[PDB]
Amino acid sequence: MIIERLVGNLRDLNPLDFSVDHVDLEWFETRKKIARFKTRQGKDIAIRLKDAPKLGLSQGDILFKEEKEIIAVNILDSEVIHIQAKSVAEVAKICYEIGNRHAALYYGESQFEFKTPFEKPTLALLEKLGVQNRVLSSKLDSKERLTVS
Amino acid sequence: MIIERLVGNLRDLNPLDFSVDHVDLEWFETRKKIARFKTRQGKDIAIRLKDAPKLGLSQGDILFKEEKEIIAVNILDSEVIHIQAKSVAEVAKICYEIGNRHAALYYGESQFEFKTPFEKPTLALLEKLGVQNRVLSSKLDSKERLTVS
């Protein structure tokens, strides 16, 4: 059957207690509403999301929950530009320019840290502005994403 | 004759000393390179700018200078949304979203203050995000503009 709605998250736990099967998504698939996926254990699922999270599906988001059986979202690591701004003025410039490119942008671990998917234009852009950055493999969790309205 | 290059600014003064005639520009005309204007005293001028300022023509920028005669840029007041951010995270969100709209954005008088031209979508956007703002008539000087690259 069609999955229309989330059933909480592994964090609003769930001390498991549960047999947890995952749908492993790329960051760029987290804002899908109508899709067909296969879980890590080989089950088919189909979503037609209603009132989907604006940010996208996040790590641990529960799509299916029946007795001890859970299917939850796993977001796969990807190549990420980790940005370190040096001032508020630079945060402003960085976010303005990335917003202008319509590139995804995520909050980092602190006030002046941001994450954006690796693509050569964004990397070129950030060097062109002399902005401190580092490319690492890591997780872009939807819950840290900056919304566009 | 064609004006290709700026001749400094009234600020790198110029204790005047000079008969200053102005070209009165709207903020949205400051990034023109090829144009024909009339000065406040009724002189015709034509620009085909080479190595034009990336930000645009700024207040006091000198286009013409011969003996005591100067023609300089005046930017006219316009309706401006003055934005007051409350945190770095909010600066990030604001600039990201405005960049996404491809709307002009300017640095304000302090770290968390920004200015953007009044248009109803931008105003709607900022209320929609609960962002503190005020509409005033004021000058958008190109030298405070955030660049898009």
Side-chain angles (χ1 to χ4, degrees), chain A residues 1-12 14-53 55-65 68-85 87-92 94-100 102-108 110-149, chain B residues 1-12 14-53 55-65 68-85 87-92 94-100 102-108 110-149:
Chain A
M1 74 164 153
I2 293 308
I3 294 164
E4 300 191 338
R5 295 189 193 270
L6 299 198
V7 195
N9 182 286
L10 295 178
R11 75 170 88 81
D12 67 43
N14 310 74
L16 343 82
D17 284 346
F18 297 96
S19 191
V20 185
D21 186 11
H22 290 94
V23 172
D24 291 307
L25 302 182
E26 304 276 16
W27 69 268
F28 54 80
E29 301 180 302
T30 56
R31 292 210 277 157
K32 282 175 183 310
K33 300 156 180 250
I34 301 158
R36 182 170 286 282
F37 302 111
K38 184 154 143 168
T39 71
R40 201 184 295 164
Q41 298 173 16
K43 302 295 185 182
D44 296 304
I45 61 131
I47 61 165
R48 304 197 112 246
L49 301 183
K50 309 299 155 184
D51 304 324
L55 294 162
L57 300 167
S58 292
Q59 186 69 28
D61 277 355
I62 298 160
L63 299 156
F64 183 86
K65 186 180 187 194
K68 264 74 146 34
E69 224 86 324
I70 283 182
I71 301 166
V73 172
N74 177 55
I75 301 171
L76 298 158
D77 285 356
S78 65
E79 296 287 336
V80 178
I81 302 165
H82 293 247
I83 295 148
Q84 178 73 60
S87 70
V88 175
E90 205 185 34
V91 171
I94 290 161
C95 300
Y96 184 66
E97 294 231 43
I98 292 173
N100 217 83
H102 300 131
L105 189 59
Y106 296 71
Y107 296 113
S110 70
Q111 267 197 316
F112 296 98
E113 292 180 282
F114 298 89
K115 303 163 316 215
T116 187
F118 165 64
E119 38 212 52
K120 82 149 223 72
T122 315
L123 185 57
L125 172 68
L126 295 159
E127 308 292 30
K128 188 204 203 93
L129 321 171
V131 167
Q132 176 174 312
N133 73 99
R134 180 167 161 170
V135 180
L136 294 150
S137 166
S138 71
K139 195 206 299 290
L140 298 172
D141 201 359
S142 294
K143 79 184 215 293
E144 271 83 46
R145 193 165 180 163
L146 279 72
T147 62
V148 18
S149 315
Chain B
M1 74 164 153
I2 293 308
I3 294 164
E4 300 191 338
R5 295 189 193 270
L6 299 198
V7 195
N9 182 286
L10 295 178
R11 75 170 88 81
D12 67 43
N14 310 74
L16 343 82
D17 284 346
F18 297 96
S19 191
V20 185
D21 186 11
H22 290 94
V23 172
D24 291 307
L25 302 182
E26 304 276 16
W27 69 268
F28 54 80
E29 301 180 302
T30 56
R31 292 210 277 157
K32 282 175 183 310
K33 300 156 180 250
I34 301 158
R36 182 170 286 282
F37 302 111
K38 184 154 143 168
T39 71
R40 201 184 295 164
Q41 298 173 16
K43 302 295 185 182
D44 296 304
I45 61 131
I47 61 165
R48 304 197 112 246
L49 301 183
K50 309 299 155 184
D51 304 324
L55 294 162
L57 300 167
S58 292
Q59 186 69 28
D61 277 355
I62 298 160
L63 299 156
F64 183 86
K65 186 180 187 194
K68 264 74 146 34
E69 224 86 324
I70 283 182
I71 301 166
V73 172
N74 177 55
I75 301 171
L76 298 158
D77 285 356
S78 65
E79 296 287 336
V80 178
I81 302 165
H82 293 247
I83 295 148
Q84 178 73 60
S87 70
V88 175
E90 205 185 34
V91 171
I94 290 161
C95 300
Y96 184 66
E97 294 231 43
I98 292 173
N100 217 83
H102 300 131
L105 189 59
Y106 296 71
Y107 296 113
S110 70
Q111 267 197 316
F112 296 98
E113 292 180 282
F114 298 89
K115 303 163 316 215
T116 187
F118 165 64
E119 38 212 52
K120 82 149 223 72
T122 315
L123 185 57
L125 172 68
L126 295 159
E127 308 292 30
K128 188 204 203 93
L129 321 171
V131 167
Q132 176 174 312
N133 73 99
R134 180 167 161 170
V135 180
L136 294 150
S137 166
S138 71
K139 195 206 299 290
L140 298 172
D141 201 359
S142 294
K143 79 184 215 293
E144 271 83 46
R145 193 165 180 163
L146 279 72
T147 62
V148 18
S149 315

